[PDB]
Design a protein around this ligand. Structure first.
Ligand code: K
Ligand code: K
Ligand code: K
Ligand code: K
Ligand code: K
Ligand code: K
Ligand code: K
Ligand code: K
Ligand code: K
Ligand code: K
Ligand code: K
Ligand code: K
Ligand code: K
Ligand code: K
Ligand code: K
Ligand code: MG
Ligand code: MG
Ligand code: MG
Ligand code: MG
Ligand code: MG
Ligand code: MG
Ligand code: MG
Ligand code: MG
Ligand code: MG
Lengths: 62, 131, 386
RNA sequence: GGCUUGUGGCAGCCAAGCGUUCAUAGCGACGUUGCUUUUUGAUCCUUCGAUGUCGGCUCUUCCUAUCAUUGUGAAGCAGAAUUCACCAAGUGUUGGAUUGUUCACCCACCAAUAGGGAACGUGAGCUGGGUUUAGACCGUCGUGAGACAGGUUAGUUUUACCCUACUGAUGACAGUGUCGCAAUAGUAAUUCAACCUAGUACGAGAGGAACCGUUGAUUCGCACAAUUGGUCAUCGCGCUUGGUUGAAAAGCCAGUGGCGCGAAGCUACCGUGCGCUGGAUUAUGACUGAACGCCUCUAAGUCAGAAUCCGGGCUAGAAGCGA
RNA sequence: GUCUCCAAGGUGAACAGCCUCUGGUCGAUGGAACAAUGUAGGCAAGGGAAGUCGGCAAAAUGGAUCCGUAACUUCGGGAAA
């Protein structure tokens, strides 16, 4: 079965051969689906306040 | 295994990076990179796992005003792993070593790249988390 | 006086002149050496650049850090519908080189091929090969055709077939004028070559009859055109300082006082792109056969039912439905450019050339953006519309 | 620039000596023959109705008196390292501190950081820090105006649309079109590391290789955009300042109002792919073999032989050509 | 290049910049394309003067409110340190 990763900002599905990995100073590993998610993360935008992210949809029971 | 694959260089000469070891140095100022044959006007550049010559600008007086080898363990410039994922660290870091590659200190403060750990067994043994 | 410091020269003098190619279709400049102890077989093929994707596979390379590890590699999809053979050409060995002796054409020629002989097909009366065709209706005409073939067998030293693409099968292309090329027949005796060519008249030759999976091949075509270009981009010369009066994107010194002429070795601004090129050692990763379960992008590891064509179609190309070749790396030209496929002229014995690649995942997400879904059904399920 | 080569630089000849003994492995005193014009002089032939006067930057080409790399002979060549010499100019010869600097001297890497020409290459290619106008300060000199192979600071770099050359672009090449052949010209690949060989050969120890094979990398070249990165007037969407349309909604103006994200296209060793093998030979080492009954790689004949040459491959395709 | 009189609204400290009303005006030969090289204006991953004679040019800073402000000093300042 195909092995898949998850984006830590949008909760999106990341397929093989793609993705951006960010290693924080505290050894925390952050994996982003695309440049949009990475830029929003580094701009300190909370995913739970963006309507299209999985976290927002889960919190709002969509 | 085999040999290290090329990765994007992001630390040209005059780059100043944090010192992640226990020696007492605060930062490392790169003056050259080992194994560089070079080209006209091209600045030598290092990446994670490279050995460089550096001086300590801030730290203990005993470590300042001299040249010592160092190995880069973290870099901010993204590089491509063979599986297609581009990855990068939060900061640029290195550790002071002797020419044989033995760590002058005893501990590493943060994570280190897998390439450096594979290249330098002593650094890997002194490391906390790899990648 | 000698130059103060040494660096290698900018650009290669082996691709001179950097002019626009005198052709649009890639020309085979040298065919593979003919070994008469092997069966008759074609040496080249014509295809069309559809697009690019990437694949993941497990690498089998002992002693390498990638041994038993996954690797992601870019690939190029070339659509290769079967070619139709319509003639045979024989050449005679002479002290001045190969000389064309005679050409024999098939009785029936498709409109697509005949379009190649006109500049305005619609406005013309469409008389091409009409009198030639009648030679197959009279007994003396068939006798004369057989005599011509016998002469080709008797006097020819190398035999090439005339084959043309079925271009109208790729509706994404807006072209009805097929591409015609000469493909050399290697193996067997001259009589065997002629019989092999004749037996294929008005018949299709699939791409797998020439190439096979894991084979190393060469790709010939015209590069992307970029028009008039300056030296900095055309040749790679370094920029002059910021404060250079009259511009900094120049070669400062284009020559010494003596010789009192500008030499051909100095970088100059001119045409960039649209150059004829021959790229070697492009491995074939898979050979998709239409309607044979190999056309789909399904692998052993990934069992998702999907086609090679990415979501939304191949940008600027369309939908791939005929046979295609998945080649490692990149190939010459933009999308839709006709590319010539050439059998390797070298002996492929290296470990890389002998490697048996097993595809694990073929990406089919949309390439017109940051595609996050592999299939339209997956996206519809994600958005609750299915 | 031209003659010359004292001076500078680079070679040779003899052999007193040095080299544990031994003139010639490696050197060469006393003498002596040369070569070169990247030194500096000597001269004043050309230029004073003007040939832009230092250095650096960029760019190409050429030389060998070869620093590294390929192949070899010799050693006071055990190994390792080194030194001498022979074919050899195919490839390469770097990042920095001080100085305007050429030059010099240090730091660092590297296989190496060799030496040079091309009007002391190159200013209608740049720059203008220095020299070398006019302002001004200091020191010494002069009664003085002023001087200064002394120091200091500020001080306008003009013109190509002509011819040629070069780069590309039409056209011509005796109907039109397709598919081809092909003289000729250009050309391209380069170097290093790691593992194994192997702690082996060698060596008393100390120390300490190499071939084959495998995996990578450097410089360079040609392409390409699946991924990552860059680019915004998609003026694509959203947010937002000031004004303005009576208000709301919706827009507009601030030459792109500003900000965030931004597809497409273009694009980066900042991303990815690819970069080739037959013959003839150089140095050298040899076969058979006389001259010269022996010997002899040579005289006749023959072999192996290189980052070499030629071909092949790649690029172009001629008042060349075929079907 | 050439002396002087009159001087609306908004924002804003402000005859600053930006927008608007009265009044004036669209006068700078026009059309198509969007090559190189230019002129003017921006952005650029990692590094941050390694470039250069020289940080030249550009970037960075910038209004207002509160806290706080060293050496030295001619006691006035420095200081918006
Ligand atoms: K170097
Ligand atoms: K020079
Ligand atoms: K430059
Ligand atoms: K002399
Ligand atoms: K004179
Ligand atoms: K004169
Ligand atoms: K310089
Ligand atoms: K001034
Ligand atoms: K004809
Ligand atoms: K050739
Ligand atoms: K693309
Ligand atoms: K883009
Ligand atoms: K003999
Ligand atoms: K500087
Ligand atoms: K200086
Ligand atoms: Mg330089
Ligand atoms: Mg040189
Ligand atoms: Mg795309
Ligand atoms: Mg002796
Ligand atoms: Mg020589
Ligand atoms: Mg050379
Ligand atoms: Mg006096
Ligand atoms: Mg030639
Ligand atoms: Mg107010």
């Amino acid at each position: 079965v195909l092995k898949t990763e998850l984006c830590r900002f949008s909760g999106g599905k990341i397929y093989p051969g793609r993705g951006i990995r960010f290693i924080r100073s505290d050894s925390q590993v952050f994996l982003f689906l695309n440049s949009k998610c990475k830029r929003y993360f580094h701009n300190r935008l909370k995913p739970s306040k963006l309507t299209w992210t999985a976290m927002y949809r889960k919190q709002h029971k969509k | 295994a085999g040999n290290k694959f090329r990765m994007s260089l992001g630390l040209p000469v005059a780059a100043t990076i944090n010192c992640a070891d226990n020696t007492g140095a605060k930062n490392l100022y790169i003056i050259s990179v080992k194994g560089i044959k070079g080209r006209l006007n091209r600045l030598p550049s290092a990446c994670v796992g490279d050995m460089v010559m550096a001086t300590v600008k801030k730290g203990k007086p005993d470590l300042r005003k001299k040249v010592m080898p160092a190995v880069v363990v973290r870099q901010r410039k993204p590089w491509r792993r063979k599986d297609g994922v581009f990855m990068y660290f939060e900061d640029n870091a290195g550790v002071i070593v002797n020419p044989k590659g033995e760590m002058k200190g005893s501990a590493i403060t943060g994570p280190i790249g897998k390439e450096c750990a594979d290249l330098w067994p002593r650094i890997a043994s002194a490391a906390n988390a790899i990648v | 006086s000698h130059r103060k410091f040494e660096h290698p020269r900018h650009g290669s003098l082996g691709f001179l002149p950097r002019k626009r190619a005198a052709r649009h279709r890639g020309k085979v400049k040298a065919f593979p050496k003919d070994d008469p102890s092997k069966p008759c077989k074609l040496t080249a093929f014509l295809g069309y650049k559809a697009g690019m994707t990437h694949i993941v596979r497990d690498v089998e390379k002992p002693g390498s850090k990638l041994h038993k590890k996954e690797t992601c590699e870019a690939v190029t999809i070339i659509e290769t519908p079967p070619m139709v053979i319509v003639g045979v050409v024989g050449y005679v060995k002479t002290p001045r080189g190969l000389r064309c002796l005679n050409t024999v054409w098939a009785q029936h020629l498709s409109e697509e091929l005949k379009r190649r002989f006109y500049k305005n097909w619609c406005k013309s009366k469409k008389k091409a090969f009409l009198k030639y065709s009648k030679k197959y209706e009279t007994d003396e005409g068939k006798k004369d055709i057989q005599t011509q073939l016998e002469k080709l067998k008797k006097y020819a030293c190398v035999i090439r077939v005339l084959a043309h693409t079925q271009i109208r099968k790729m509706k994404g292309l807006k072209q009805k004028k097929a591409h015609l090329m000469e493909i050399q027949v290697n193996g067997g005796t001259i009589a065997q070559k002629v019989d092999f060519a004749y037996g294929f008249f008005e018949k299709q030759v699939p791409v797998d009859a020439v190439f096979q999976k894991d084979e190393m091949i060469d790709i010939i075509g015209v590069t992307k055109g970029k028009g008039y270009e300056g030296v900095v981009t055309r040749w790679g010369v370094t920029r002059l300082p910021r404060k250079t009066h009259r511009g900094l994107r120049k070669v400062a010194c284009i020559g010494a006082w003596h010789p009192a002429r500008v030499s051909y070795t100095v970088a100059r601004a001119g045409q960039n792109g649209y150059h004829h090129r021959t790229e070697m050692n492009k491995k074939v990763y898979k050979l998709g056969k239409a309607g044979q379960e190999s056309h789909a992008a399904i692998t052993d590891f990934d069992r998702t039912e999907k086609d090679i064509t990415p979501m939304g179609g191949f940008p600027h190309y369309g939908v791939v439905k005929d046979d295609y070749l998945l080649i490692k790396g990149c190939c010459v030209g933009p999308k839709k450019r006709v590319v010539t496929l050439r059998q390797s002229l070298l002996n492929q014995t290296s470990r890389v050339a002998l490697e048996e690649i097993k595809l694990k995942f073929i990406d089919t997400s949309s390439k017109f953006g940051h595609g996050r879904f592999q299939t339209t059904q997956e996206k519809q399920k994600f958005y609750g519309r299915l």
